[PDB]
Every structure is written in structure tokens, then in C-alpha cells.
């Protein structure tokens, strides 16, 4: 419904409406529930959980091993819970938040970065749990500086109108939003 | 009886910024975003013109609340309004003089349609004649009150300083003078004399502007070729950069010159469409005392007729 | 826009692709969350799934309107579309031909007048 | 009818007070100017974060990363790309100022003619027959309160353009000849008040065989004794 919103940048802002062109989870999409094989790692994976069942994660096509507190691949780094895995630019990013799917709105604060640059195509967990797309959002911030609402700009045309005006209330009227053009099918 | 031609509105357009500069070039879409927002300005200006044209037509014509109708017994004390009042045997609601007037006068280009169609404009101007004839000037300040026509015309003479015993003793002479002067309007408009000169220069200056905006799509501006795609299939991508950057910086200035000179031209239509809104209120809906504003002489009454993007008065 | 076949020499024609524009008619978000979408002149055969197909497909001179119901009313205009078509929210969105005003007629005759009797200060 | 006119004027001012103390926002013409100026300034502000083909949108890192042999090539693109945005802003402000001056000249004309005297121009100082007006101020604007005069409660009669008495026509001084069916009266043209047709409110011209639609009656003479 509305889950999986994080902080794409380490820059503080306050009381603004900043749009972000980054990889996110779309809204109202179908996630696979599992009441456990090696699932494919497309470009980034959402993950939640329920006491003391879920231990870790096996990654890799050098295969990456996280337990919970690390195994290499060549480097070791020993340091309702939601997680976001991303393989960006030869780094590795994990985001996190835990609260007491529910239907609220809670942001996800960053946890760790890893400068490794490894090869991953599919992933597996180490023993309920729940299992990203190029999008564009419209993040609303507050006084202290936390995200309180966001709008996916490609779900329905009302959201596209709200993303064009950069506002969350649209008064009565008619609005131009986009353009369309059919594509060439084959070569001749 | 004289004639006076004014312009009211002009052609609504809107030009897409992206496809004009580089249609179907996914790396030029990355080259244009290095220029920030020069395309959301140009669409916001050309939208502000297009709504503004649909406000000019509203305040010239839509000034009565009701829609009055002429009675089926057209017996007006000696006069004959059959040239200007509509007759339903035609395929439109349009009258006889207005049919003489409707004959005398893509790379991103789209033309929006008007809001009030020509069969809605032609119903406003049939309400303004039907109230002026049957109710005097009483329908400008409230609700219409009927009055005989030769008693209406008797104290439109009493405004310009001629006592009302002149018209009742000369009623049939004026009716023959009034009916004769209408016919010479219908001759001198349907002849080879081209009187719609002011409305024609609105339309011609909107075609010289678009014959030039398209003509600039064949100038190389210092590049190797004018065709966008043939530069792409003849160069390396790190050396196709500085050839498209002469076309994008070139073709922005041809949009930027077009939009500005449309904004200055659109401002002298409001100066003309606010004058026609005044002559609709003061010449038609009442008798005027301003010298040589409604006609040339002492003023009696007026009758509006429509035209393509304009209005035509008949100052008696 | 016309070019000979180089191999078999039949004369064939060129005309470009669709290239319209989109518009999103909407009431206030503090009233509803239902929109009606207008495309710019594409004749309704060349088209998000409820706002792409289904019923409520209507052909205007302004374009192809999908998501509002054509009625036989005539009301004061609320949201302009073009060519005398206006849309409003009265519960769903309807589209119609706009009206100019109330029909009226005046009892004209060669011997009658209507003097007023009272007034109003506005 | 002084008391009735007084209470109608007081009730009208009260209804204007209510229609403005409510949250009906009718100051759209005063609000659009502020919105257009603020939006033009915000666009001019956000033009500084564009790079226009260079390596960075900030001048300082270009100066600190390059040397005056090949830093000037980077600086020139930014200079041209910022001059064009300034020139566009200044040209559109010069276009908006003419619209504001046209509205100010119309407001000066209304202040001279509606407030400092009574107008005869139709639908200039309000839709109706005009009496007076009252200026009020506003942020960057002016508001008028036009006091018009609208007739109401009409009623049919039967009219005639003259009176033949003894082979002479008789036309009114100012008024129409009306009738309730039996008698004939002269009355003013905007408020029904009949009077007795004497030689104090008519005049005479010619003989009564030329007028089309004349009606017999009898003219009273005010010199009775
Ligand atoms: C008003 O003028 C029109 C045209 O000038 C008159 O219509 C003509 O009437 C004669 C009858 O004597 C016919 O022979 C013509 O064919 C008519 N012409 C047209 C174009 O209709 C009309 O009769 C005049 N009005 C009155 C009341 O006489
Ligand atoms: C003055 O007389 C005329 C004619 O008798 C009245 O007009 C008619 O009014 C009735 C009632 O509304 C309508 O049904 C008719 O259609 C009217 N006649 C025409 C030709 O339209 C008029 O109402 C009278 N004025 C007043 C104030 O009663
Ligand atoms: C003109 O209209 C006014 C209403 O605007 C009439 O005033 C009413 O008069 C009656 C009779 O005394 C009172 O009962 C009402 O209370 C009055 N109305 C108001 C709002 O106070 C006035 O009578 C009308 N003129 C004529 C000649 O009838
Ligand atoms: C038309 O108006 C006249 C003027 O008031 C009316 O004549 C008077 O009518 C009243 C009754 O309402 C009588 O008491 C008066 O004596 C009449 N005046 C004279 C001089 O006789 C007349 O009645 C009205 N017409 C109709 C049909 O009522
Ligand atoms: C209007 O009044 C005149 C003056 O009385 C009328 O003219 C006379 O009418 C009588 C009645 O038939 C005749 O006997 C006289 O011969 C007329 N006099 C002249 C000089 O012709 C006239 O008829 C009246 N009009 C109407 C329509 O009643
Ligand atoms: C910011 O935090 C403080 C303390 O946690 C809280 O009292 C305040 O309400 C917060 N501000 C907002 C806008 O929520
Ligand atoms: C386009 O619209 C016309 C009606 O104006 C219709 O006859 C025609 O079939 C439409 N085109 C297609 C492909 O349906
Ligand atoms: C409008 O009128 C037509 C008459 O041809 C009718 O077929 C149609 O059903 C009417 N529309 C509605 C919504 O009833
Ligand atoms: C008014 O017109 C009718 C026919 O329309 C006619 O019979 C009548 O005589 C006319 N009345 C006058 C006073 O001319």
C-alpha cells in the first residue's frame, strides 16, 4: 500500500517539496509472501519480517554472506524490521526502520555503505517475511526534517497532476500534463 | 448609415518545446536538460495568450443575460430589418449581411479550437438586435420593457436637440431614407470592393510568423548539416556533441523570437477588444453624446454584426 | 511526403505519427479523486486502463474524451473544453453542450408600453 | 420615499460587508499580479543551478580546479547562459508594466468621472443608472462601490403618440401618453405617476391629419374662473 520510503541524500532540508529521480518501490504493487529458494536480485530488493527467526542473507551469482556478523566477498566488516538492498556504482547500501503489511507511512533511515564492488544476480535468506523500479516521487518534509508524505508520479493521472504543479491540493480546472507519440514498430 | 470594422480575437496556438528543437533524439533530450527550464516558460506564455483570446470574445458579446427573440409580426412603423435579422431557411442561424462577410475573408504546431463556436456568437448578436428594436435601451439597466418602434425613434431625436414633432410629421420620408441606406451597404460589401482590410491583417501576420518558424528548421547555424539524424549516423558520440550544440542554441533563439513578438502583437488586440467592448455598451445599449465616437454626426442608434475574429457596427 | 519505391517502382506516401497532447480535467481534491482525461484530436481508436479503454468514450472536436458521460442537458459552463463543451461534477463527471441563457420573448405591439412602478438601490 | 431609500442603501452596504467578510475570495485580479511576479522571480533564482554545457554550475570549483589557460572556456558558457535569462526576465517585466499602466489610467479615469461627478456613460460606473460611488483601498489596487438605480415591477398600458383636439396635434413636454383603458394620462418615463392632461404639460404643432396613430381626447384648461 504505502511502504518503503527512504532518504536518498545525506542533505538536510526542511518544509520543502523536493522531487527525486531514483530507484524506489512503486505503490500498491504485488509483493510475494512466504509463510525458501534463491530468489533473483533484479536491481534492488525490499524485505520485511515479523521473534528471533530470521538470521541472515546469502547473496551473489565470490558470494556475499551476511549473518546476524559478516563473512567476506575479500573483506570483512564486523559491526517488524524493514530493509532495502541496493547495488549502486560498485557500492552496497542497506536502509532500515523498525516500528511496533500495515497501512501507515514510515520513512527508512540509512544504516551502512560497503565499498566492495562485487557481482550479484540472485539472493537467498538464512533462517513471516515479505519480498525496485525507476520512479519519481514528490517528498514532503516537515519542521524537524523527516518525510511525512510522498506521491508516486506515475500511478494515476491525479498524481501526475499533483507532481506537475508540485502541490498536494489541486483546485478545480483543466491542466496539461504530458505528451504522447506512438513508436515505430519494425525496421524496413 | 456607415460601417466600422474592429478586430476582437486571434488564432490560438501552442508549440511543444521539445519536439520542435529535437524530435526523436533521446540524447538531445539529455542535451536540452542542461539548459534548465527554457521550455516550461515558453509553454506558460503561449497558454496565457490562448486563455486571453477566450476572454476577449466573452466581454464583447456576452453582455445580455437572457436571449431575446423577435416577434413573428415584423411590422415596425415603416422600416425593414430583413437584411440584418436572421431567417431560418439558411443552413445556419446566420443573417444575410454576415454571409456577405464570411466570404470576403507539422514539427510541433497545433492550433486549439475556439470555445464559442460561430453558431453561438451568431446567437448573441441576434439577441442584441432583438432587444434594441423591441425594447429601446431599457434592457441595459435591468429588464426589458416593450415600446413601439416609431415612439422609440421619436425621442432618440429628443436627445440631439430636435423636437419630436419632426419625426411624426416626416415618418415615411425617414423610412424611405433609412431603407435606402441599408441597401447601399449591401451593394458596397458584396461588390468587388474589399472593405475587410483590418481583419485580413490579423490573419496574414499570423501566417508570416509561422512560415518563418518552420523555415528555420533548414538552417545549419554553423553545423555540418541541417538534418538532425544524419549528424547522428555520421559522427562519434563524443564528437556529435559540439555539432548539436550549434543547432539547439540556434533553434532556441528562433522560438524565443517567435514567442516575444507574439506577446507584443497579442497586447494590441486587448487594446482593440476593449474598445469594441465600450462601443457595444455605449453605442448599442444607449445613445451616445461623445462626438465622432459612434459614427460621424449626431448619433441615433447602432446594430452589431459578426465577422471572423471581429465585429462590424452600423452606426445610424 | 511521397517517394518512389527504388526496387519495384510503386509510388508510396508518407505521413507522420500521432503526436497529440494530454489534459486532466479535475474537480477540487477536497471534493473527490476522480478525473476525466482528454486527448488532443486522436479520434478515439488509438489508445492506466480505465482512462485508456472501457465505456464513456466520447468524440469531441476538441479531441477524444474518456471518463465523462455525455448527457442531454445544457447548463452554465463550469470547466471549458472547446467547441461549446463544458464538464462538471454532479455523483460523477458529466459533459454537455453549454447553454447561452434563458429563453425569452417580448410582447411587441404598435400600441403598448410597460412603465415601471417601483425601484431598487443596488 | 427618503426612508425607504435610506433603509435599502443601508441593507445593501450590509450585504457587501457580509459578502466580503465571508471567505469568498473575489480579489483574483489583485492576487494574479503577486503570483506572476513571484513566479518570475523564482524562475530567475533557479536558473543559477544550470550548467549550460560546462563542467559545473558553481563558479568557484571551476576556478579552483582549473588554470586561466582553460578555465575561461568554461566561464564563457555560464556568462552567456546567464545573460540570456536576465534579458528574458527584463523583457517580460517591461511587457507586464504596460498592462499595469493601462489599468492605472482606467482607474484614474474612473476616479475622476464616477467619484467626482455623475456619469452618463452606459455601464461604465456600474450596471444600471448611476448615482454616486465610493473609493476604497486595497494592497496594490483600488476598489469602488458603485451605487446604481434599477427599476422594477412593470405593468402593461396602452399608449398613443399624440392627441387631436380641434384639428391640432398635441405632444407632451416630457412623458408618454398612457391609458388604463378609460382615461388618458401623461407620465414620466421611468416611474409611474399619472397626471391630468392640460396645456401646462403639452404643446401643439400643426393639424392632426398627418400623425399616424393619433387618439381623440379632451384637453383641460387650467384657467377655470
Ligand atoms: C424588406 O425588403 C425585402 C428585400 O428588399 C423585401 O423582400 C422582397 O419582397 C418582394 C415583394 O414585393 C419580393 O418580390 C422579393 O422577392 C423579396 N425579396 C427578398 C430578398 O425577400 C421585403 O418585402 C421588405 N419588407 C416588407 C415588409 O415589404
Ligand atoms: C403584458 O401583456 C402581454 C400580452 O398579454 C403579456 O405577455 C404574455 O404573458 C403571458 C404570461 O407570462 C405569457 O404566457 C405569454 O407568452 C406572453 N405573451 C407573449 C406574446 O409572449 C405580459 O405578461 C403582460 N405583462 C405583465 C406584467 O403581465
Ligand atoms: C417597492 O418595493 C418595496 C420592497 O423592496 C416595498 O416595501 C415593502 O412594503 C410593504 C408594504 O408596507 C411592507 O410590508 C414590506 O415589509 C416592504 N418591504 C421591505 C423589504 O421593507 C414597497 O412597498 C414597494 N412599493 C410599492 C408601491 O408597492
Ligand atoms: C383609470 O384611472 C382613473 C383615474 O383614477 C379611474 O377613475 C377614477 O376611479 C375611481 C375608482 O378607482 C373613482 O372613485 C373615481 O371617481 C374615478 N375618477 C373619475 C374622475 O371619475 C378609472 O376608474 C381607472 N379605470 C378603471 C377601468 O378602473
Ligand atoms: C376623432 O374626433 C374627430 C372630431 O370629432 C372625429 O371627426 C368627426 O367624427 C364625426 C363622427 O362620425 C363625424 O360626423 C364628423 O364629420 C367628423 N369630422 C370631420 C371633420 O371629419 C373623428 O371621427 C374621431 N375619430 C375617431 C376614430 O373616432
Ligand atoms: C519536532 O520534535 C519535537 C520533539 O521530538 C516535537 O515536540 C515537535 O512537535 C516536532 N515537530 C513537528 C513539526 O512534528
Ligand atoms: C475518425 O473519425 C471519423 C468521424 O469524423 C470516423 O468516420 C472515422 O472512422 C474515424 N477513424 C477511425 C480510424 O475510426
Ligand atoms: C439523449 O437523447 C437521445 C435522443 O436521440 C437519446 O438516444 C439518448 O439516450 C439521450 N441521452 C440520455 C443520457 O438519455
Ligand atoms: C397595429 O398593427 C395592426 C396589425 O399588425 C393593425 O391592424 C393596427 O391598425 C395597428 N394599429 C395602429 C394604431 O396603427
Coordinates of N, CA and C in Angstrom, one line a residue, chain C residues 16-85:
Chain C
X16 N 3.1 11.6 -41.0 CA 3.8 11.3 -39.7 C 2.8 10.5 -38.7
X17 N 3.3 10.3 -37.5 CA 2.6 9.5 -36.5 C 1.7 10.4 -35.6
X18 N 1.2 9.9 -34.5 CA 0.1 10.5 -33.8 C 0.3 11.9 -33.3
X19 N 1.1 12.0 -32.2 CA 1.6 13.3 -31.6 C 0.4 14.2 -31.2
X20 N -0.3 13.8 -30.2 CA -1.3 14.7 -29.6 C -0.8 15.4 -28.3
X21 N -1.7 15.6 -27.4 CA -1.4 16.1 -26.1 C -2.5 15.6 -25.1
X22 N -2.1 15.7 -23.8 CA -2.9 15.1 -22.8 C -3.5 16.3 -21.9
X23 N -4.7 16.1 -21.4 CA -5.2 17.1 -20.4 C -6.0 16.3 -19.4
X24 N -6.0 16.8 -18.1 CA -6.6 16.1 -17.0 C -7.6 17.0 -16.3
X25 N -8.9 16.8 -16.7 CA -9.9 17.6 -16.1 C -10.1 17.1 -14.6
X26 N -10.1 18.0 -13.7 CA -10.3 17.6 -12.3 C -11.1 18.6 -11.4
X27 N -12.0 18.1 -10.6 CA -12.6 19.0 -9.6 C -11.6 19.2 -8.4
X28 N -12.0 19.8 -7.3 CA -11.2 20.0 -6.2 C -10.9 18.7 -5.5
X29 N -9.6 18.6 -5.0 CA -9.2 17.4 -4.3 C -9.9 17.3 -2.9
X30 N -10.4 18.4 -2.4 CA -11.3 18.4 -1.2 C -12.8 18.1 -1.6
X31 N -13.0 17.6 -2.8 CA -14.4 17.1 -3.1 C -14.4 15.7 -3.6
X32 N -13.4 15.3 -4.4 CA -13.3 13.9 -5.0 C -11.9 13.6 -5.4
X33 N -11.8 12.4 -6.0 CA -10.5 12.0 -6.5 C -10.6 11.3 -7.9
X34 N -11.6 11.7 -8.6 CA -11.9 11.1 -9.9 C -11.7 12.2 -11.0
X35 N -10.9 11.8 -12.0 CA -10.5 12.7 -13.1 C -11.1 12.2 -14.4
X36 N -11.2 13.1 -15.4 CA -11.6 12.8 -16.8 C -10.6 13.3 -17.7
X37 N -10.1 12.4 -18.6 CA -8.9 12.7 -19.4 C -9.3 13.0 -20.8
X38 N -8.7 14.0 -21.4 CA -8.9 14.5 -22.7 C -7.6 14.4 -23.5
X39 N -7.7 13.7 -24.7 CA -6.5 13.7 -25.6 C -6.8 14.7 -26.7
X40 N -5.7 15.2 -27.3 CA -5.8 16.3 -28.3 C -6.0 15.6 -29.7
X41 N -7.2 15.4 -30.2 CA -7.6 15.1 -31.6 C -6.9 13.8 -32.1
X42 N -7.3 12.7 -31.5 CA -6.8 11.4 -32.0 C -7.8 10.4 -32.3
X43 N -9.1 10.8 -32.3 CA -10.2 10.1 -32.9 C -10.5 8.7 -32.2
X44 N -10.1 8.6 -30.9 CA -10.6 7.5 -30.0 C -10.3 6.1 -30.4
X45 N -9.5 5.8 -31.5 CA -9.2 4.5 -31.9 C -7.8 4.1 -31.6
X46 N -7.0 5.0 -31.0 CA -5.5 4.8 -30.9 C -5.0 4.8 -29.5
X47 N -5.8 4.3 -28.6 CA -5.5 4.4 -27.2 C -5.2 3.0 -26.6
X48 N -2.8 2.5 -15.9 CA -3.8 3.3 -16.6 C -4.6 2.4 -17.6
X49 N -5.8 2.0 -17.2 CA -6.6 1.2 -18.0 C -8.0 1.6 -18.1
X50 N -8.6 2.2 -17.1 CA -9.9 2.8 -17.1 C -9.9 4.1 -17.9
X51 N -8.8 4.8 -17.8 CA -8.6 6.0 -18.5 C -7.9 5.8 -19.9
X52 N -7.9 4.5 -20.3 CA -7.5 4.2 -21.7 C -8.5 3.4 -22.5
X53 N -9.4 2.7 -21.8 CA -10.5 2.0 -22.6 C -11.7 1.9 -21.7
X54 N -12.7 1.1 -22.2 CA -13.9 0.9 -21.4 C -15.1 1.6 -22.0
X55 N -16.0 2.0 -21.2 CA -17.1 2.8 -21.7 C -16.8 4.3 -21.6
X56 N -17.8 5.2 -21.7 CA -17.6 6.6 -21.5 C -16.7 7.3 -22.6
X57 N -16.6 6.6 -23.7 CA -15.7 7.1 -24.8 C -16.6 8.1 -25.6
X58 N -16.1 9.3 -25.8 CA -16.9 10.3 -26.5 C -16.0 11.2 -27.4
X59 N -16.5 11.5 -28.6 CA -15.7 12.1 -29.6 C -16.1 13.6 -29.7
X60 N -15.2 14.5 -29.4 CA -15.4 15.9 -29.5 C -14.6 16.4 -30.6
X61 N -14.9 17.7 -31.0 CA -14.0 18.4 -32.0 C -12.7 18.8 -31.3
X62 N -12.7 18.9 -29.9 CA -11.5 19.2 -29.2 C -10.6 18.0 -29.1
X63 N -11.2 16.8 -29.2 CA -10.4 15.6 -29.1 C -11.2 14.4 -28.6
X64 N -10.6 13.4 -28.0 CA -11.2 12.2 -27.6 C -11.3 12.1 -26.0
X65 N -12.5 12.3 -25.5 CA -12.7 12.4 -24.1 C -13.2 11.1 -23.5
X66 N -12.4 10.6 -22.5 CA -12.6 9.3 -21.9 C -12.8 9.5 -20.4
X67 N -14.0 9.2 -19.9 CA -14.2 9.2 -18.5 C -15.3 10.2 -18.0
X68 N -16.1 10.7 -18.9 CA -17.2 11.5 -18.6 C -18.4 11.1 -19.4
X69 N -19.6 11.3 -18.9 CA -20.8 10.8 -19.5 C -21.5 11.9 -20.3
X70 N -21.8 11.7 -21.6 CA -22.5 12.7 -22.4 C -24.0 12.7 -22.1
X71 N -24.5 13.8 -21.8 CA -25.9 13.9 -21.4 C -26.7 14.8 -22.4
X72 N -28.0 15.0 -22.2 CA -28.8 15.9 -23.0 C -29.2 17.1 -22.2
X73 N -28.4 17.6 -21.3 CA -28.6 18.8 -20.6 C -27.9 20.0 -21.2
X74 N -28.2 21.2 -20.7 CA -27.5 22.4 -21.1 C -27.4 23.3 -19.9
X75 N -26.2 23.6 -19.4 CA -26.0 24.2 -18.1 C -25.1 25.4 -18.3
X76 N -25.0 26.2 -17.3 CA -23.9 27.2 -17.2 C -22.6 26.6 -17.2
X77 N -21.6 27.1 -17.9 CA -20.3 26.4 -18.1 C -19.5 26.5 -16.8
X78 N -18.8 25.4 -16.6 CA -18.0 25.2 -15.3 C -16.5 25.0 -15.7
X79 N -16.2 24.1 -16.5 CA -14.8 23.9 -16.9 C -14.8 23.9 -18.5
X80 N -14.1 24.7 -19.1 CA -14.1 24.7 -20.6 C -13.3 23.6 -21.2
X81 N -13.7 23.1 -22.3 CA -13.0 22.1 -23.1 C -12.8 22.6 -24.5
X82 N -13.8 23.1 -25.2 CA -13.7 23.6 -26.5 C -14.9 23.2 -27.4
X83 N -15.2 24.1 -28.3 CA -16.3 23.9 -29.3 C -17.6 23.8 -28.6
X84 N -17.8 24.6 -27.5 CA -19.1 24.6 -26.8 C -19.3 23.3 -26.0
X85 N -18.3 22.8 -25.3 CA -18.4 21.6 -24.5 C -17.8 22.0 -23.1

